[PDB]
Design a protein around this ligand. Structure first.
Ligand SMILES: Nc1ncnc2c1ncn2[C@@H]1O[C@H](COP(=O)(O)OP(=O)(O)OP(O)(O)=S)[C@@H](O)[C@H]1O
Ligand SMILES: Nc1ncnc2c1ncn2[C@@H]1O[C@H](COP(=O)(O)OP(=O)(O)OP(O)(O)=S)[C@@H](O)[C@H]1O
Ligand SMILES: Nc1ncnc2c1ncn2[C@@H]1O[C@H](COP(=O)(O)OP(=O)(O)OP(O)(O)=S)[C@@H](O)[C@H]1O
Ligand SMILES: Nc1ncnc2c1ncn2[C@@H]1O[C@H](COP(=O)(O)OP(=O)(O)OP(O)(O)=S)[C@@H](O)[C@H]1O
Lengths: 317, 338, 324, 315, 260, 260
DNA sequence: ATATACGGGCTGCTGTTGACAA
DNA sequence: CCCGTATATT
């Protein structure tokens, strides 16, 4: 169950987007020149999946438990529990006489400085019986000494064009009826994270039965593009009280949050023509508004203040 | 308080009788929600809570069983905390432990929850608590709402986070006006010889603000200084007020760095004698605003609010007090020469 | 037992609002493929109740010891407990069936509330825990603010926002409860009470109980609800603007001093002032400035500042604007 | 076998293409054989450890196994066992022909505690007639003053383009890899001083492409970050918010977390050519924004507001 | 109730468990033939035991095998709760019941009218390696006594880091070397002695081993009467012991270690 | 003791190099004189490193011992603001309206000075707050400096992120105190003053410790912070005797502050 | 007429991991 | 950092 981990890729050819990196990794595997990797990027891109597919391709099914170590954030990572076990692991003469060993180090940005220094020594000392692989999200929490010996690979955010066919395959696999606007709205409401495009589908399909733009927007609660355009039109032209009443009624009818409205208004403000200074004023006030909505205040007053900050500067000009 | 002429029954209350009848109607049937009492200090919330407990139970609330308890932090550290908790009702003040209040609340509340058919657990001064302690208290008071009820007491219901505020009723107690204070002072003194003329009682009530505790203390203090009262007899004041008055007088007579250092040392000495920074700021504002008469008055008020927010956000008081003093001095110097 | 604990939803067909989540839970009950859950929203909408009802009617009251654990904010959570205890529970195996022969789901449920009060170090272990063990355990996180949770924790859970309740639904539920408990309500009193409650089920239920126990079982009007809630009278609130419009600083200070003497919370005063401001005959610029000042004062009060000085600042800014 | 970063290691002392003075002096000292204790410092990726090991091998020769001691950070360096073993090795007598002495090397000595160093400083001034020391480190502020007070401190520097190009040409000639001038310039640009990084990048590019054209180098991944922020700060100097936001949007779409960007902004801002008032205000705004981001509220709007506040200062 | 087991001499099980106790956790294996407790460390060293059904008097199992993980220290403390020094004539009896998955392990002990009851909740399982050492690729094998190496392995705990084992048909038949702070220390053992029951080495083999992994063999060497050493082509070391009880039965303990 | 004077080290180094030169043996380049004072300049009165560097350099600057800056010297360096006469360069200027913020060129890096003193930032800021008043002549600059110090204080008030961002506070405080001094910062305007004045130590430590001990002495002894804020005003207006001996002294302690 | 040393101001105010002496 | 003073030496 739980589609996201039910349809996880099991081979290197069932991924998308990044193609040069995958071909380079395949060439590394073919010539048996696998270096130490430092895979980093934003959430939901396919790092652990890629490394696990590489591990399953390299080794047999009965050897994965005796020649592969896995250390994560839920395990213990100090000094002694690394100085003993991994030094002994590199002190192990290889069983099955084939290949080398692997130590997967997930969430590598959690260890301390001493552990990283010892790991630098471990990885540099003996590059014939172990091949470390670090996977991180922040590159500021890795010491430069350990950052200068592992091949850095960047996994950027995904793009809709190659993101569509995998969702189409998932839809076809089960019995789901899909539309055109539904796919576009489903893909758009995910900033490159594929896991936020596969879980929304499961949540929506199990509540209504069919997927459409209105269906997904009601399942999640995101405001529509036309709604944001109407709000902006009401802001830029009409009076104070009339705009307040209109947006109040619109928000009361369909319960809408304030974060998404702020994000869409920010994008539309940057997309329209303004004489510099007004844009600076709007950006500053809207950033303050967004910051102030994480303490426990009231949303109505924040909406009124957003209206007030947007109104006067454009009304005078 | 004086604790010698305080009532112990919902009847014969000198003020705020209607809400007392409402509380009696609520307590006479059980089936209680959690209670949160708020209002200005000196209004007498503790008397209401104690009388509610007396009405809910029998007469077994008039005993004192002061108890000590030692608990342990996660590693080894020990916390000693004293409770006045007598039979049935349990009373605790988890503010004597600075950052051990969270574990105090957890352990003590979870022990007493398993230990009418229900008890109460008072939590005095809920204002000065961290954020995690309130979370744990809220969860444990929601979980076991079948054998124990909570009656929190505080003032300025703004520090308590909304989830607790939206989890219990809210009872408010306002200050007891002015005429009622003079009447209660007159009756309490007439019970014990001599009397208070109406003018003297009115002057004491006006000068003692809204706090009946302070008014009673001032009246008793004046009674031990002079037995025959007159129509032109003043009231003694504390030594932390005249000091602030002198500091405010000196902060405006001259504006030089040496005077700034002198007033900084004065603030140091005043802070040494256990006066919180907030009262210092309030008194300084009152004395300074006593004579501004202009836009500088509003500017000073806004800057003082800014500095107060800064003080309650930061961790060093003297920095902010000195900054406010310097800004006021500069503004007054600029205004004087124009 | 108070009315809040007596009318707690014991079944999925007792939650009023939130159609999508209840539909998803119903579909996943008589079937399979239930994903991870992440509930968030304002207080008094019902999040613990829904998951507790789902767990109760999926397993049964006699099968709670070895199927569900709840880790609240009173459990001393840290890295060690997440590393050992949660892993040990999640690494077990599904037990047998129940007494009454019914279909059963082959998974356990781990419930943890106030996950926003934890630390990042524990959250990393927690997020890695529920990937390799997605065969026998499902996780239901509950929070008020999503921002206090790291990205990989919220990137693998279905996010469900709980809307604040509507007028008609709250009115119907309150009428049902009042009919059940035999209390005489007025058609205008309920319409005022729902407005006062600002969209809170628990607050409205407590208000109803406190009103019916005070009155003893007679008709309750709006005047009782105003006294119980504590709404500031409009005649007093007009004086603030009357003094701020013209005069001097001393009268403004005296008015605010009396208002804070009476014990009213500053949040209610700000909320009521905001309604008056945006409906009067004032220019747009003055309204904008006053609204921004009100928002700033509200935030500063929410960050544990003083009450007298902030009210003085707001009133002084209003005095400056109204005399311009 | 091994990758290209650990297989092409110099075995002699004249293959090192780093600094020119210290290496020549070390060659002269190895010729003579009366070296004092030395402490080497410098940026990573130069070859300090290579120089130390080559010097020791040249000094000893065939008796290296039974007359050399090497200690690391993976190996336990407490106080008790380390002081015991050090004193065993110092007091033990060995025969060396004319002027060769016993060598004790402690790599990355900055990780030692104060107790270890304070116990070590006694053994390094008495047995000097039969043994000598040699230390390599990165941060030289960690070593206490008394230990430095009797050592020769040699400080390295980041490699320039000429030596990097010469050794890269040597490697290419050895491996017979068809090349192009602009591609090698791009590789050197990506290197940014460190040399093992450059060799690893070249090997990664050559893995599955067969050419070192610039397009292939950029396609196979990487790219240097700071020079983009350097232009962005200059753009915000002149109140050009419209031109300033473009680079921020590009970086955000590239996949960089807010903290990584905001740290580099501060680091580039400190070493810049501006006035004092502007520097003060910029530092203040960056500090407030970093506090906000660390508290959890991170998004594009906060960075846009920071840019707007930076541009407001100059009006 | 899955498996229930009763016995009247706890000392046999207690000493068998103590002969293998150097970790904190252990994994059990209940089968129609008996129990088998195994432990692993550093993904290289692995020690296993065996308690056949002949020892037991009341043994009952249900359906298939049963696996669970138990803390070893707590179990060993609970077993020997009546003092580890009984005079001849005093015995302790124990009963244990495990009622399937998800329920703890019972232990009722009795001696001379004193009855104790204890429970151990189990959170299982882990995964074990596949150290197959079938006697097909074994090249060097030897069998020998214990009193010879009592002091020898007792004189083996120094501040060294590697132990060298060399076996050859000629000259150093069985030599152990330890390089430490002071100097070398050789402990050559010749053939045709009172502790040389069979010498059948074929080709010379010199190998290095870690002291940390091979140290806990002292406990197995102390409570033993014979030791068998086996090494294959690659260089993996297999140690076989032979322990006896008061009644006069025999139980075996095996150790597997990998070379450097 | 005191560091060796330049002349003594100069004469001894000259004697040593003369002795080496007289050894002859071969045509070896004597180290140049111009580098010989450079060797002694970057050693700070330490013979052993000077001799080591001379040996290293005579093989055919080296010996860059790190400096410690003597914190009381760093404070003076920050608070004295050695300025230049605005040598003709292409530094950016404030275009039109910021004409009152023009400053002369600076020859000090505050970050290096603060780092090299080896002190925590929150202590450096306290010392600066204690010692920065006396060097100022105007009030507006004092106001600006106080505001900058307060803003530096705000950034470190939490506990989880107190050590993630600490350089910002110290940098802001140092640069604000340095730039706000417009009276001093006009190059050739330092004549004449800067008499023989010693610095001091912050007085906040004793006051804070007294506050804490008085907190405890108020709590545990009237426990049935708020007591010092609310109950202790009542204590200040209590002034009546009671039944004890060590408590009358405490009552007379708080309530007898000097006042005419 | 020029290089070098005295004089006066500093030890100080919640959690998770690691080394030392017994 | 800062100012003024007592001794070795050419
Ligand atoms: N590019 C992709 N190709 C294929 N499947 C993908 C891709 N991106 C995400 N997925 C799927 O989404 C699931 C969740 O993403 P993960 O790989 O677990 O995230 P991640 O890369 O590990 O980053 P973290 O764990 O948040 S640091 C994966 O198990 C895949 O099934
Ligand atoms: N109805 C009353 N009649 C006479 N005196 C009263 C009455 N109510 C209170 N008092 C007096 O008020 C004083 C006690 O004040 P309280 O109301 O108990 O202050 P409080 O409730 O403790 O407020 P906090 O929050 O604890 S500071 C005593 O002097 C009482 O005698
Ligand atoms: N959506 C709802 N449907 C029906 N009754 C509700 C709903 N929300 C609240 N209630 C009523 O209010 C009571 C309190 O609900 P809870 O589940 O405790 O609130 P909650 O989910 O804990 O939200 P908190 O506690 O403010 S974070 C329930 O027992 C119901 O009687
Ligand atoms: N000066 C140099 N000349 C030639 N190759 C060099 C030089 N410096 C570094 N290298 C290369 O760097 C590779 C490994 O670098 P190391 O010498 O191990 O780094 P390091 O000197 O130990 O400094 P660390 O350990 O990173 S702080 C060698 O295989 C060389 O190819």
């Amino acid at each position: 169950l739980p589609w996201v981990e039910k349809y996880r890729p099991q081979t290197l050819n069932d991924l998308i987007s990044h193609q040069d990196i995958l071909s380079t990794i395949q060439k590394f595997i073919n010539e048996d020149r696998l270096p130490h990797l430092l895979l980093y990027g934003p959430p939901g891109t396919g790092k652990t999946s890629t490394i696990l597919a590489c591990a399953k391709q390299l080794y047999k099914d009965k050897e994965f438990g005796s020649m592969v170590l896995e250390l994560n954030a839920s395990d213990d990572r100090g000094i002694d529990i690394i100085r003993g076990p991994i030094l002994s692991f590199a002190s192990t003469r290889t069983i099955f006489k084939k290949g080398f060993k692997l130590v997967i180090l997930d969430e590598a940005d959690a260890m301390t400085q001493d552990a990283q220094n010892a790991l630098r020594r471990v990885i540099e000392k003996f590059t014939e019986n172990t091949r470390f692989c670090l996977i991180c999200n922040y590159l500021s929490k890795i010491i430069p000494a350990l950052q200068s010996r592992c091949t850095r690979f960047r996994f950027g955010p995904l793009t809709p064009e190659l993101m569509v066919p995998r969702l189409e395959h998932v839809v076809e696999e089960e019995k789901v009826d899909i539309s055109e606007d539904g796919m576009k709205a489903l893909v758009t409401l995910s900033s490159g994270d594929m896991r936020r495009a596969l879980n929304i589908l499961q949540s929506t399909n199990m509540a209504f039965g069919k997927v459409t733009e209105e269906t997904v927007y009601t399942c999640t609660g995101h405001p529509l593009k036309s709604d944001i355009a109407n709000i902006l039109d009401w802001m830029l032209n009409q009076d104070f009280t009339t705009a307040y009443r209109n947006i109040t009624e619109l928000k009361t009818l369909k319960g809408l949050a304030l974060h998404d409205i702020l994000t869409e208004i920010h994008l539309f403000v940057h997309r329209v023509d303004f004489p510099s200074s007004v844009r600076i004023h709007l950006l500053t006030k809207m950033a303050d508004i967004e910051y102030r909505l994480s303490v426990g205040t009231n949303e109505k007053i924040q909406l009124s203040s957003l209206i007030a900050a947007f109104q006067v500067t454009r009304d005078l000009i | 308080w004086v604790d010698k002429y305080r009532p112990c029954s919902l009847g014969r209350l000198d003020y705020h009788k209607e809400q007392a009848a409402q509380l009696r109607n609520l307590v006479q049937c059980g089936d209680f929600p959690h209670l949160l009492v708020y209002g200005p200090s000196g209004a007498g919330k503790k008397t209401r809570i104690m009388c509610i407990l007396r009405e809910l139970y029998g007469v077994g609330v008039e005993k004192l069983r002061i108890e000590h308890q030692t608990i342990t932090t996660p590693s080894k550290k020990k916390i000693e905390i004293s409770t006045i908790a007598s039979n049935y009702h349990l009373e605790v003040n988890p503010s004597d432990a600075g950052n051990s209040d969270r574990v105090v609340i957890q352990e003590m509340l979870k022990t007493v929850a398993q230990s009418r058919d229900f008890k109460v657990v008072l939590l005095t001064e809920v204002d000065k608590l961290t954020k995690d302690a309130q979370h744990a208290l809220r969860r444990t008071m929601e979980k076991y709402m079948s054998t124990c009820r909570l009656i929190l007491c505080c003032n300025s219901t703004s520090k308590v986070i909304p989830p607790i505020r939206s989890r219990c009723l809210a009872v408010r107690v306002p200050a007891p006006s002015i005429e009622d204070i003079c009447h209660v002072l007159s009756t309490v003194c007439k019970k014990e010889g001599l009397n208070l003329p109406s003018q003297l009682a009115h002057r004491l009530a006006e000068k003692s603000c809204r706090n009946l505790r302070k008014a009673l203390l001032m009246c008793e203090a004046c009674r031990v200084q002079q037995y025959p009262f007159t129509a032109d007899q003043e009231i003694p004041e504390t030594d932390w007020e005249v000091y602030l008055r002198e500091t405010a007088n000196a902060i405006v007579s001259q504006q030089t760095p040496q005077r700034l250092l002198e007033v900084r040392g004065r603030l140091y000495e005043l802070l040494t004698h256990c006066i919180p920074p907030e009262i210092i700021m309030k008194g300084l504002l009152s004395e300074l605003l006593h004579n501004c008469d202009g836009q500088l008055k509003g500017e000073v008020a806004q800057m003082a609010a800014y500095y107060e927010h800064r003080l309650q956000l930061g961790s060093k008081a003297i920095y902010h007090l000195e900054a406010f003093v310097a800004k006021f001095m500069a503004l007054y110097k600029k205004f004087m020469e124009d | 037992v108070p009315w809040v604990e007596k009318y707690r939803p014991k079944c999925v067909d007792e939650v009023a609002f939130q159609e999508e989540v209840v539909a998803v839970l119903k579909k996943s009950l008589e079937g399979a493929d239930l994903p991870n859950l992440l509930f968030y929203g304002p207080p008094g909408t019902g999040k613990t109740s829904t998951i507790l009802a789902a767990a109760r009617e999926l397993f049964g009251p006699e099968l709670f010891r070895l199927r569900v654990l709840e880790l609240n904010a009173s459990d001393e959570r840290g890295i060690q407990v997440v590393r050992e205890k949660v892993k040990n529970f999640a690494q077990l195996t599904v037990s047998g069936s129940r007494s009454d022969g019914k279909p059963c789901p082959p998974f356990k449920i781990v419930i943890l509330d106030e996950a926003d009060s934890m630390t990042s170090a524990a959250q990393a272990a927690l997020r890695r825990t529920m990937e390799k063990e997605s065969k026998t355990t499902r996780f239901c996180l509950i929070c008020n603010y999503v921002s206090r949770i790291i990205e990989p924790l919220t990137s693998r859970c279905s996010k469900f926002r709980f809307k604040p309740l509507s007028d008609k639904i709250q009115q119907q539920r309150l009428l049902d409860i009042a009919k059940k408990e035999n209390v005489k309500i007025s058609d205008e009193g309920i319409a005022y009470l729902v407005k006062v409650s600002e969209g809170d089920l628990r607050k409205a239920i407590t208000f109803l109980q406190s009103a019916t126990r005070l009155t003893g079982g007679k008709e309750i009007t709006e005047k009782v609800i105003t006294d119980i809630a504590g709404v500031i009278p409009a005649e007093k609130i007009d004086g603030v603007f009357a003094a701020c419009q013209s005069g001097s600083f001393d009268k403004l200070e005296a008015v605010v001093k009396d208002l804070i003497d009476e014990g009213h919370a500053a949040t209610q005063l700000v909320n009521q002032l905001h309604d008056v401001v945006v409906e009067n005959n004032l220019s747009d610029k003055q309204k904008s400035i006053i609204t921004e000042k009100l928002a700033e004062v509200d935030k500063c009060l929410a960050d544990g500042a003083d009450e007298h000085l902030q009210l003085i600042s707001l009133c002084a800014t209003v005095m400056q604007q109204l005399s311009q | 076998e091994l990758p290209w970063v650990e297989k092409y290691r110099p075995v002699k002392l004249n293959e090192i293409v780093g600094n020119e003075d210290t290496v020549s002096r070390l060659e002269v000292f190895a010729r003579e054989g009366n070296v004092p204790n030395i402490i080497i410092a410098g940026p990573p990726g130069t070859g300090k450890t290579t120089s130390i090991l080559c010097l020791a091998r040249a000094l000893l020769g065939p008796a290296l196994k039974d007359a050399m001691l090497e200690l690391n950070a993976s190996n336990d360096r407490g106080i008790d066992v380390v002081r015991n073993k050090i004193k065993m090795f110092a007091q033990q007598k060995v025969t060396l022909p004319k002027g060769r002495h016993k060598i004790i090397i402690l790599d990355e000595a900055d990780s030692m505690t104060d107790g270890a160093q304070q116990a070590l400083r006694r053994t390094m001034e008495i047995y000097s007639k039969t043994t000598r020391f040699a230390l390599a480190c990165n941060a030289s502020d960690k070593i206490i003053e008394p230990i430095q007070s009797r050592c020769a401190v040699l400080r390295y520097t980041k490699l320039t383009d000429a030596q990097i190009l010469t050794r890269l040409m040597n490697v290419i000639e050895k491996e017979r890899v068809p090349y192009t001038d602009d591609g090698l310039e791009a590789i050197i640009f990506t290197a940014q001083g460190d040399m093992r990084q450059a060799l690893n990048n070249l090997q990664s590019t050559f893995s599955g492409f067969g050419f070192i054209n610039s397009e292939n180098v950029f396609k196979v991944c990487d790219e240097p970050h700071p020079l983009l922020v350097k232009e962005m700060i200059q753009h915000c100097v002149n109140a050009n918010i419209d031109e300033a936001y473009k680079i921020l949007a590009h970086l955000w779409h590239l996949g960089y977390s807010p903290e990584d960007i905001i740290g580099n902004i501060f680091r580039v801002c400190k070493t810049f050519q501006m006035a004092e008032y502007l520097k003060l205000e910029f530092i203040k705004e960056i500090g407030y924004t970093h506090m906000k981001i660390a508290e959890g509220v991170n998004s594009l709007l906060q960075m846009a507001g920071l840019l707007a506040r930076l541009c407001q200062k100059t009006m | 109730y899955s498996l229930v087991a009763s016995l009247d001499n706890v000392r046999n099980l207690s000493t068998i468990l103590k002969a293998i106790h150097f970790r904190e956790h252990a994994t059990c294996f209940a089968t129609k033939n008996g129990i088998k407790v195994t432990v692993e460390n550093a993904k290289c060293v692995q020690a296993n035991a065996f308690i056949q059904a002949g020892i037991f008097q009341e043994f009952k199992v249900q359906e298939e095998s049963v696996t669970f993980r138990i803390n070893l220290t707590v179990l060993l403390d609970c077993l020997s709760i009546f003092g580890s020094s009984p005079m001849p004539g005093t015995l302790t009896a124990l009963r244990m019941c495990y009622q399937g998955y998800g329920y703890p392990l019972m232990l009722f002990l009795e001696e001379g009218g004193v009855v104790t009851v204890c429970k151990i909740n189990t959170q299982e399982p882990e995964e074990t390696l596949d150290f197959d050492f079938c006697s097909t690729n074994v090249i060097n094998k030897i069998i020998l006594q214990s009193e010879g190496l009592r002091e020898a392995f007792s004189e083996l705990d120094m501040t060294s880091e590697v132990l060298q084992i060399t076996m050859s048909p000629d000259k150093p038949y069985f030599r152990l070397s330890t390089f430490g702070n002071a100097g070398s220390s050789h402990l050559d053992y010749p053939k045709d002695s009172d502790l040389m029951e069979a010498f059948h080495c074929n080709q010379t083999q010199v190998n290095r081993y870690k002291i940390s992994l091979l140290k806990p063999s002292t406990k197995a060497l102390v409570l033993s009467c014979k030791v068998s050493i086996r090494t294959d082509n690659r260089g993996f070391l297999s140690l076989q012991y032979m322990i006896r009880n008061e009644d006069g039965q025999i139980c075996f303990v095996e150790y597997y270690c990998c070379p450097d | 003791f005191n560091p060796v004077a330049p002349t003594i080290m100069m004469k001894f180094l000259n004697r040593i190099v003369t002795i080496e030169a007289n050894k002859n043996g071969g045509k070896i380049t004597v180290p140049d004189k111009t580098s010989l004072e450079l060797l002694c300049q970057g050693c700070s009165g330490d013979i052993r490193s000077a001799i080591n560097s001379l040996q290293f350099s005579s093989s055919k600057a080296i010996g860059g011992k790190d400096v410690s800056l003597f914190l009381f010297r760093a404070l003076g360096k920050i608070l004295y603001c050695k300025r230049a006469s605005l040598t003709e360069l292409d530094s950016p200027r404030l275009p039109s309206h910021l004409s009152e913020y023009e400053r002369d060129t600076l020859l000090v890096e505050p970050e290096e000075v603060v780092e090299m003193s080896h002190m925590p930032g929150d202590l450096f800021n306290l010392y600066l707050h204690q010692n920065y008043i006396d060097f100022f002549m105007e009030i507006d600059d004092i106001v600006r400096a106080s505001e900058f110090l307060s803003f530096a204080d705000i950034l470190s008030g939490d506990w989880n992120t107190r050590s993630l961002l600490r350089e910002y506070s110290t940098s802001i405080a140092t640069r604000g105190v340095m730039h706000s001094n417009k009276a001093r910062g006009y190059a050739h305007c330092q004549g004449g003053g800067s008499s023989f004045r010693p610095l001091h130590k912050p007085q906040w430590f004793l006051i804070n410790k007294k506050y804490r001990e008085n907190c405890l002495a108020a709590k545990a002894l009237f426990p049935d912070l708020c007591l010092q804020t609310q109950l202790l005003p009542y204590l200040a207006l209590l002034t009546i005797p009671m039944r004890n001996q060590a408590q009358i002294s405490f009552i007379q302690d708080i309530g007898r502050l000097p006042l005419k």
